């Protein structure tokens, strides 16, 4: 299970409970979601994701309970380009989730091109930190970098303007309260700059009872490193 929690203050190379997909790998005590060359420089056309191995009991039909969960994490992005792409996302999906074919670039390793905006063809809740918004390729995006809440589609149900800061760690707290059904996101930079966004969603109508949680990132023609520095997660089933 009814309750599960784990904490990664750092990510040593000796990992046993992380499922690595695509190009994701551990380097220098952090998870590099997207591929980097020998000099640690980012490269184009790469997708990578990690998931915690144990499944999370998100809700329970029989007992009418839904989990209260919190995910705290920090990441940094770096690129020599003026338009580093494409972004990193914290996501919740069915346990057998894998990288969809062609999900690179602006699809952040979460959606397949053909059904990216078909809400009835997907089962995913994600919080994206999207740094690439060219209106000719990322037609679904607002015209500025943003934090978005994605529910079964790459076209966010809600976005707020966000500032990308090269090489600076962003600390994020994502919380879900089953009583109000509010998914809240609060992100801060070390100088105190803060971003907040909330959305009401009944997770029971979007995801199965058991899910896996993790992160995904991708780079298309433009690129940047997507470094996950720390992560703690806790979930507990509660009556509603």
Ligand X SMILES: CC(=O)N[C@H]1[C@H](O[C@@H]2[C@@H](OC[C@H]3O[C@H](O)[C@@H](O)[C@@H](O[C@H]4O[C@H](CO)[C@@H](O)[C@H](O)[C@@H]4O[C@@H]4O[C@H](CO)[C@@H](O)[C@H](O)[C@H]4NC(C)=O)[C@@H]3O)O[C@H](CO)[C@@H](O)[C@@H]2O)O[C@H](CO)[C@@H](O)[C@@H]1O
Ligand Y SMILES: CC(=O)N[C@H]1[C@H](O[C@H]2[C@@H](O)[C@H](O)[C@@H](CO)O[C@@H]2O)O[C@H](CO)[C@@H](O)[C@@H]1O
Coil, helix or strand at residue 192: coil
Contact indicator for 77, 226 with CB cutoff of 8 Å: yes
Which of positions 37-96 make contact with ligand Y (CB under 6 A)? 44-45, 85-86
Following CA atoms 91, 23, 26, 227 in sequence, which dihedral angle do they give, to the nearest 10 degrees? -60
Please state, in angstroms and rounded to a whole number, the distance separating the CA atoms of residues 221 and 235: 37
Contact 65, 181 (CB under 8 A): no
Question: Where do contacts with a copy of itself occur on this chain (CB under 8 A)?
Answer: 2-9, 12, 14, 16-17, 52-55, 57, 60, 62, 95, 209-210, 232
| Shortest reach from residue 118's CB to Ca ion, in Å | 18
Per-residue binding string, Mn ion, 120-139, x by CB under 5 A, is ----------x---------
Q: With contacts defined by CB under 6 A, name the span among 4-12, 59-67, 119-127, 136-144 that binds ligand X.
A: 136-144
Residue 67 Cβ vs a copy of itself, minimum distance, rounded to whole Å: 12
How far, in Å, CA of 134 to CA of 207, rounded?
Answer: 30
Calpha distance 215→119 (Å, rounded): 20
Report the residue number, 137 or 234, with the smaller CB distance to a copy of itself. 234
Residues forming the annotated binding site for Ca(2+)?
Answer: 128, 130, 132, 138, 141, 146
């Amino acid at each position: 299970q009814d309750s599960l929690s784990f904490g990664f203050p750092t990510f040593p190379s000796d990992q046993k409970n992380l499922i690595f997909q695509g190009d994701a790998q551990i380097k220098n005590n952090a998870v590099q979601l997207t591929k980097t060359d020998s000099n640690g420089n980012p490269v184009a056309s790469t997708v990578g994701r990690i998931l915690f191995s144990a499944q999370v009991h998100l809700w329970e039909k029989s007992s009418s309970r839904v989990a209260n969960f919190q995910s705290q994490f920090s990441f940094s992005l770096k690129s020599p380009l003026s338009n580093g792409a494409d972004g990193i996302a914290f996501f919740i999906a069915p346990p057998d989730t894998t990288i969809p074919s062609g999900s690179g670039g602006g699809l952040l390793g979460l959606f397949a091109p053909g059904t990216a905006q078909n809400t009835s063809a997907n089962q995913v809740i994600a919080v994206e930190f999207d740094t690439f918004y060219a209106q000719d390729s990322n037609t679904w995006d607002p015209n500025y970098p943003h934090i978005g809440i994605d529910v079964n589609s790459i076209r966010s149900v809600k976005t707020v303007k966000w500032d990308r800061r090269d090489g600076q760690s962003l600390n994020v707290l994502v919380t879900f309260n089953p009583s109000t059904r509010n998914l809240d996101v609060v992100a801060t930079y070390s100088d105190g700059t803060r971003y907040e966004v909330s959305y009401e969603v009944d997770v029971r109508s979007v995801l199965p009872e058991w899910v896996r949680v993790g992160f995904s990132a991708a780079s298309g023609e433009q690129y940047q490193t997507h470094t996950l520095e720390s992560w703690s997660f806790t979930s507990t089933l509660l009556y509603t």
